[PDB]
Amino acid sequence: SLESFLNHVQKRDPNQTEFAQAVREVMTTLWPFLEQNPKYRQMSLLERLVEPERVIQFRVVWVDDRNQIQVNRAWRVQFSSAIGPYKGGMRFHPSVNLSILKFLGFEQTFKNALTTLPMGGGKGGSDFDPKGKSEGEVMRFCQALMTELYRHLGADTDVPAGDIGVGGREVGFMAGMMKKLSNNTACVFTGKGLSFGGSLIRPEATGYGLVYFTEAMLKRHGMGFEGMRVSVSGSGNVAQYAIEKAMEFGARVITASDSSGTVVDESGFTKEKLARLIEIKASRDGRVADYAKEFGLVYLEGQQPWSLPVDIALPCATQNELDVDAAHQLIANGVKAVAEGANMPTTIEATELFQQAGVLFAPGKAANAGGVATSGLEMAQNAARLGWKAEKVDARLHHIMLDIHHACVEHGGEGEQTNYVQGANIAGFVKVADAMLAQGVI
Amino acid sequence: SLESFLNHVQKRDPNQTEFAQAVREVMTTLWPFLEQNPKYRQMSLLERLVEPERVIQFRVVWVDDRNQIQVNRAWRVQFSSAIGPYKGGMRFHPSVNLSILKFLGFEQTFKNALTTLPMGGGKGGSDFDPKGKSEGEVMRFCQALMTELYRHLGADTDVPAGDIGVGGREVGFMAGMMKKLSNNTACVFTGKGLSFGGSLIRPEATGYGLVYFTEAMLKRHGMGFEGMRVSVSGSGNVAQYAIEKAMEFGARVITASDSSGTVVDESGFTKEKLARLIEIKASRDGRVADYAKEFGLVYLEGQQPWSLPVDIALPCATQNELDVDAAHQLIANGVKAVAEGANMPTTIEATELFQQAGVLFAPGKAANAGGVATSGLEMAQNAARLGWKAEKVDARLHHIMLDIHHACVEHGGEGEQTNYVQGANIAGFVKVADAMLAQGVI
Amino acid sequence: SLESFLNHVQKRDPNQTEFAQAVREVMTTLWPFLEQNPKYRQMSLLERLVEPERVIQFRVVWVDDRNQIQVNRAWRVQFSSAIGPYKGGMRFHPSVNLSILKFLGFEQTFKNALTTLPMGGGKGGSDFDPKGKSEGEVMRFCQALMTELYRHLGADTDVPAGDIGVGGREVGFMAGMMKKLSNNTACVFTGKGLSFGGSLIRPEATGYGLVYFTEAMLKRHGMGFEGMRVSVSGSGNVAQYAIEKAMEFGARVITASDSSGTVVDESGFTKEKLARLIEIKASRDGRVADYAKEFGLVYLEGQQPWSLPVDIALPCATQNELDVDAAHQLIANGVKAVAEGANMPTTIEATELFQQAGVLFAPGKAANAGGVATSGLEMAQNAARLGWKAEKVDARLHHIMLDIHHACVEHGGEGEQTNYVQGANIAGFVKVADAMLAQGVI
Amino acid sequence: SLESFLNHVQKRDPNQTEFAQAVREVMTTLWPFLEQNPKYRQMSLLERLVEPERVIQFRVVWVDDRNQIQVNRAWRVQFSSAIGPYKGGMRFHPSVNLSILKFLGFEQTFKNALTTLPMGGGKGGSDFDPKGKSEGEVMRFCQALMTELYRHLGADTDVPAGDIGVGGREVGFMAGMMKKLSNNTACVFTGKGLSFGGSLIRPEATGYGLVYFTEAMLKRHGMGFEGMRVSVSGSGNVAQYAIEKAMEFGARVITASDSSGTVVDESGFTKEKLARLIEIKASRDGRVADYAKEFGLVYLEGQQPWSLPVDIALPCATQNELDVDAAHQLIANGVKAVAEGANMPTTIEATELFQQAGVLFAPGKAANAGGVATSGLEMAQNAARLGWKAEKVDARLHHIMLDIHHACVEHGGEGEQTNYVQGANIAGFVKVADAMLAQGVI
C-alpha cells in the first residue's frame, strides 16, 4: 500500500509539504515496478532512501552596507552518497526552507543517478534574499556562509553548484573562500568560470543534449534528424542551442517562440539567423516578434508552434505548454518524435496520446540531462588537470547522452517502441538502489 | 651467496614457512641477474625489499546470529609503496596467518609492478571463516573489520580488493563502511559493482588476459591458439572467459572442471555450450556434472583434466592443482604451453619439469595479471570520474598484456625459448628496485 | 576449563613462547576468581582481552657510521585502550620479537590498570642492537623509527617511554622527532628530561615505590624496614633509589651489585656512600668493584647477594636473577620478605618456594609499578602545563603505592599472609574488565 | 602612475633588488593595457597580485660527512593559487634568498598561467650548496628539508619540481620523504623518474617546445624552420633538444656552446653528431671544445655564437647572454627571428633593438614554457593513474605551445609583426586577473 508508506514517512515531517509531494510522486511512479520486483523493497530500502544521510543547518552572520548585523539560516542537505559524492546546487531565496531543500535533493539524487555519472544527490541554500544586495553584501554573505560550510564539503564528499539566487558570481565567491580556508584547489563547486576550472559547452549543454538523446531515439527506430522538419518552442538557452545542434544534424528547424508568441520560418534557421536571435534575447527587452521583423519572417502573435506540420517537436519553453489538443494536431500532421527540452512540458494525457499513437517520446528528466551531465564533465576535467577544447567536451557530452539513452532502453520494455518515460523513471531508481544494497546497512 | 642471504632473512621470521619459500623462489630466479648487475645489490636493496613497509595486525570483535561474541584476527600487509599505493586483495579463510599474507603481498608487489600501472603491493585478511555464515553475519564482520581498518586505507595510500573468501558481496560491505566512516567516496576498493564505480570487463579480465598473453607467447615461438587443443581446469569467471576468448582465437577448448570433476568435449566448447555452463555454475548447486549430462558429454568423476592429451593447458581453478604426476602426463602426451589463469596452480616441482621439458610456461604473475591490471583501470576510471566502454577497457587490457609479455621476453634470456618465470620476476624487480633507489633511504 | 582456553588462544600464535607463558600465568591465577564471578567471563571478555587491539610492525632503514645501510624491524603493540591511551616503554635489543613485546604489553595493561591512573597498555621496540653504537647512529636510528611511528602516537592515543636499550637519551631523540613531524608539543613521551617536560622524582620513582609498597606489606604483617638487614641486587636506577628510600625508612642496606660482582657492607649504606655509587654508576662502564675499593668494602667477585643473611631481599638487576638455590639460602638464613624492583627477577620455582616457607612476597607486577605510576604523573603535569615540586610528586607516588597495596590485599585471600601474586592479578584484571564491559563490543 | 605604484610596492621590500626589478618589468609592459582596461585595475588587484599568498622560511639542520652539524635556510614561496595549486621548482645554491625566490615565483605565476593548464605559482629553495657534497650529504639534506616542508605541500596545494641545484636525484629524495611522511603516493613533485611517476618527453620538453612555438611564429609571418640557418647557445638539456627538433624541421643548426666557448659547424648538426655531443656533455668533464676537436670543427674559444650569420638565433644557455652588441651583430648579419630557450637570455635593450629592426622575437616566458607545461602533463598522467606514450605526450605538448602562441597573438597588437613581449605578458596577466576577480576578496 502506497498511502500507508506515504503516511508513515510523513510522521517525521508532518509540515514539510514540498518534500511530502516529492516522495509521493516518486513512489507513485515506482509502485508498479516495485510490486513486480520485490528485490528493490527488501532491507527496508524504501525507508532508507527517503531519509537523508545528513542535513546541516547553520547560522550565517554578516554585516550589511549600513553596518547592520544580519542573521540568516543556511542548509546543506546531503541526501544520498550511494553512487558518488553529494551533488546539487545552492539556492538563495527568502522562501527557502528545509522542506523545499529536501524535495530538491531527493529529486536530484535520481536525476543525477540517471545521467550514469558517479554523482550522489544533495542540495543546499539560505533564506538570504539576494534581491537589492550590493556586490559587497553578497560577497560577505557568501564568505560568512563558507566559513561554516567549508568543513562539510570536498571533491569526494560534496560538490555544490548554482541555482536560483546563486549564479556564476556567487559560485566564484564560494569556491574562492573554499580554496582559501582549505588551502586546497580541488574541484568543490561546478559552474566555475573559465579562468579557474569551469568547462566549455556549459551554455550549449542542455540544448545539445536534447538533440543527442533524440537522434539516438530516432536511430534505434530507423529514423534520424537528417532532412526532418523540426518545431522548437521557447527561445532561451535550451531552445537556442537545440536549434543549433539540430541544424548540424541536417534538420530544418522552422520555429522558435516566447511567451508573447511564435516565429515561423519554413526556409529554416541558419547559423546567422540563430546568432541574431541569441543576441536579441540576451537583452531584457528582446522579443521573438523583433527577430521576425528583422528577418522578414512570419510571426504568430500569441500562438504556439504546434499547429505546424513537423516530423519532430521539441518543447523548450515551460511546464504544461503542450497539451492534449496540440498532441492531437501534431499526430494528425504526422509527427514522428517528441523530446522535452523544458521541465515537464507535455501533459500526462498528451504524453499518453503520443505513445499510444506510436510517436517516439523522450521525457525531460532524460533528454534535458545535458545541463547536469556537463557539471560532471567539469568535475572530470578538473580531476584530469587538463582543460578540454569545446569539441572534446561536446564529443564526450554526446557519448554521455547515448549512455543515458541506453539506460532508458534497458528498462524501457519489450514493446515495438521503447517506453522512455518508464525507462527514465526506473533507471534512476535502480542504480541508486543497487548501490545501496551492495553497500550494506550504513 | 644466496643461501647466506636466505639464512639471514629467516632469522627474523624462523617460522614463516610460506614467506621463506616465496623469498627463496624469487631470489633464486634473480641471483644470476644480480651477479651481472651489481647496481641492484647496492644500498642494502634486497634487505629493504624483503622487509614489508608496514603491517597492521588487529582484533575484530563481532556478534553472531546466536548472540555470541566472536573474536578474530585481521591483517593488512602494506608491503611496498615504491611505485604506487599499496594494492592487493583481502582473504577470509581460517588458515590465514601473517606468513601467508606476507608471501602473497610480496608476490603482489612484483605482479603489480609488471602490469606497468602505478600500483604498489599489499595483502590483507582474517582467520574469519565465511563458511556457513549467514549474510548478516558476514556483513557485521566486514563492518567490524572496517571499524579499525578504514584509518589505514585511502585512494592514494592503500586500495584493497577481493580474494578467497572475499567476493563482490564483501567488497561492497567494506567499501560501504569505508565510505560511511571516512565521509569520502573516492576509490579505495576495486572489484566494486557497476552501480558504485566498478568497471566493465572486470569479470572477463583475468581469463581474457590469460589468452591475450598466451597468444603473444605462442606467436613469438611460431605457434598460435588457432587449431590447438586446449584443456582448461576450473569453471568460475577465470575459466569461463579464458574459454570464451580462446574460442574467439580458433582454439578447440575441450575440458572444464570443478571440485567434483571434469567434463571432456572432444568436439569442443561453443558459445551456446559455454553460455549454458555459466548459467549452471551461476546457481549455488550447479555442477560441471549437470552440464555434462545436458549435452551428453564425457564426465570424469573426481578427476582433473590433466590426463588428456592437449597442445595447451590452462589451469584456472586453484593453488597447487597442477603437481608433478599431472605434469608428467601432460609432458609425455606432448603439451606445448602451460599458462596460469589461477593463482599459483603449478607447484614448484611441476613448474621446473615444464621448463626442462621445453614446454612454454607462463607464470600467473604475468599471465593472470589481467585482473589486477584491470583493477588499476578501475581505479583510473574512478579517478577520471568517467567510466569506459567495454571495448576501450578490452583494448587497453590487451595492450597491457602485450607490454607485460614484452618485459618478460626482455629479461627471459637468449635460449631457444624465453624463460617467462625468470623474465617476469626480473622485469617486476627492476621497476620496484629503480623506484626504491631513486626515492632514498626511507 | 583453563587448558582448553589456553589451547584455543595458542592456535593463533603457536610459536609465541613468551606470550603463552604470560597468558597462562594470568589465567591460572584468575580462573578461581572467574568461577566465583561469572560476570567476568561473559561477552567473550577473556578472548577479547588476550587479543591486542592493534599491532604495528614496520621497517626501519638507517645508515651507520661507515655508510652501510642497515635494515631493522620495529613494533608498537597497542594492546588495550579500555582505561586510557596505550602506555608502555620501547625496548631496543636484538632478541626483541612480537612474542616478547606482546608478553610485555599484556603485563603493562594490568600494571597500568593497578596504578589507578587512566592508562591503557602497550609496548614497543626494535631488534636494533644499541650496543657499540655511537650517539649519532642511535639518533639516526631513532629518527628513522619515528619517521614511521609518529603517525600512530598521540597525547590521547599512545604515549611511550623507555625500557631496556632506551634511556633518557633515546626518549629525547624520539620525543624531539615526534614534535618536529607533528608540529605539536603535547606529552607523547614520558621519561623526558627536566628541560622539556620531564618530572621530578622520575629517576627515583621505581625504587621509592618498591620501598613504599614493601613497607605497607611489612606493616600489615607486623613488621617494617626499621633495623632490618636488606640486600639489594643491581646498581642502576632502581637499586640506587631503593637503597635511598630504605635507608630513609631506617633499614641497614648491606649490598649492591652488578654483572661483575657484589659489594657487601655490614654497617650499611649511608647517604655519603650512596651518593658516590650513583656518581660511579652514572657512566655506563662504572663498576661496583671500584665503589667497594674506594670505601674499603668487601667485593664478592662474581657472586650475587643472596648468600648474605638478611631480613628482606630486593632483587633490582634483571629477569631470573633469583632462583631456588638462592631462595633456599635466603629462607635458611631467615628471610622475612622478598619484593621485586626489577621485572620478573624471581623464577617461578623460587617464588613458590618463598610462598611455601611463609616468606612475604611482593611480585614486580605490583611492587615495581612506581615507575609507570610516575610516568602517569608526568602526563598529568604536562596536561596541566605546570610542574610539581618533588615533595608533591613523591607524596602522590606514595599514596598510589598504598592504593595498589590495598587493592592486592582485597583479593589476596584470607590466609595467614596476603597472596600478592593472586591479589595483583585479580585487582589489575578487574579494572580492565569493568572498562571493557561498560564500553561495548569494539 | 607606474613609478608611484612601483614605489608603493617597494615600501615593504626596500632591499629585494631582484624582486623589485621583476615587478617593474612586468608592470612596464602591462601599463598601456591597464590604462585601456580599467577593469583590470579594480579591487586593488595589482597590490594583491604582487604580494605572495604565503612564504614559509625555515631552519634546516643536517649532519655532514665529518659529523659536523650544519644549519641552512630554506623557503617555499607560495605565490598565487588563483588558477590551481602552487607550482614551481626548488633551487639549491648559496646565493638563494627571499628576493630571488619571489622574483622567480612571481614570474612562474604568469608562465604557468600561459600554458592553459591549471597551475598556480610558487618557488622554493635553500642556500644549501650541493657543490662538493656527497650523495649521502645531499640525501640527508633533502630529507631534513622535507621533514619541515612536507606539511605545506600536497597534490592539490603545492607541487614542486627541480631547478638549479635540484636534478632528478634530489626530486627523488624529496618525493620519497614526502611519500614516507604523508603515507600518500599522490603527485606532489614533478620531474620524477620513470620508475615512480615521471613522464616521457620531460627531458625533451623545453627544447621541443621552443622549436614548436618558434615554428608557429615563423609560419604566422611567412617563414619556417625549413632550410634555415640556426644558431644555438648552450649544450645542456634545452640546447640539445632544441637542436634535435630544429634538425627534424629541416634546419641547418650550426652552433652549440658552453661557458668555455663555441663550436661552429657550417654543414650542420646531424643525429650522430648530436648524439656524441650529448655523451660528451653527459660527463662531468665534457667540453664543447672536445666535441669540436673530435669532428674537426671550428672552435671559437670563449666567444659566443652571435657573430655568426643565421636566420634564427636560439639562446639556451643563461640569463643575459645576448646583449645589444650581439643583437647588432645578429641584425647586421640578417637574422629573422630570436626565441629564448633559456630564462631571459636577451637583455631589454637587445630585445627592443630586435623589435625595432623587424626581427621576430619570442620571449622565454612563452617560448620556453614547454618544460613546465610538460610538468603539468606529468601531474595529469598521475591524476589519471595512467602513463602516456611519448607520442601522446609530445602531441599534447605541441598543441599547448600552439595555444600559447595563439594567446600571445591575441594580445600582440596589429602591426606588421606580433609583439610577443606584450602578448605573453598580457595573456598571462589576464588569466590570473580574471581568476582573482571571480574568487573574491580572500
Swiss-Prot record, chains A, B, C, D:
Q: How does activity depend on temperature?
A: The enzyme remains active when heat treated or when left at room temperature for several months but is inactivated by freezing.
- Binding residues annotated for substrate, in chain numbering: K87, Q108, K111, G162, S375
Catalyses: L-glutamate + NADP(+) + H2O = 2-oxoglutarate + NH4(+) + NADPH + H(+)
* Upregulation: Induced by growth on glucose and ammonia.
The record's top EC class is oxidoreductase
One biological process GO term for this chain? glutamate biosynthetic process
UniProt entry keywords in alphabetical sequence: NADP, Oxidoreductase
The EC designation for this entry is 1.4.1.4
The record ties this protein, via SMART domains, to: ELFV_dehydrog
Q: How is its activity regulated?
A: Competitively inhibited by homoserine and by glutamine.
Q: How does it assemble?
A: Homohexamer.
This chain's function reads: Catalyzes the reversible oxidative deamination of glutamate to alpha-ketoglutarate and ammonia.
Q: Which PANTHER family does the annotation name?
A: NADP-SPECIFIC GLUTAMATE DEHYDROGENASE 1-RELATED (PTHR43571:SF1)
**The protein's name in its UniProt record:** NADP-specific glutamate dehydrogenase
